[PDB]
Amino acid sequence: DAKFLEILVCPLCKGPLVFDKSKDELICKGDRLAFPIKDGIPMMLESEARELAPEEEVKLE
Ligand SMILES: [Zn+2]
Numbered sequence: 001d002a003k004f005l006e007i008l009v010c011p012l013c014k015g016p017l018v019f020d021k022s023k024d025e026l027i028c029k030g031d032r033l034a035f036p037i038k039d040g041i042p043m044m045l046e047s048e049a050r051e052l053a054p055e056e057e058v059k060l061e
Helices: 054-060
Strands: 018-020 025-028 033-038
Touching: none
Parallel strands: none
Antiparallel strands: 018 025, 025 033
C-alpha cells in the first residue's frame, strides 16, 4: 500500500537534523535552518525552512 516514508536529513546539505521538542521543529545546525513539523509530519522542503535567530543559535552552542 502507498505510505508516507521520508528520510530525515536536511534537504540542502543532507546532514542530520536536531529535534527541538519545544518548537516541534527539526534543525539543521550546519545551515542554521529550522524545518517545521506539521500535523506530526516533518516538512522536508527548503521553502518551508526558517532561518534561526542568533538568540537561537546559542542553545545549540
Ligand atoms: Zn543542512
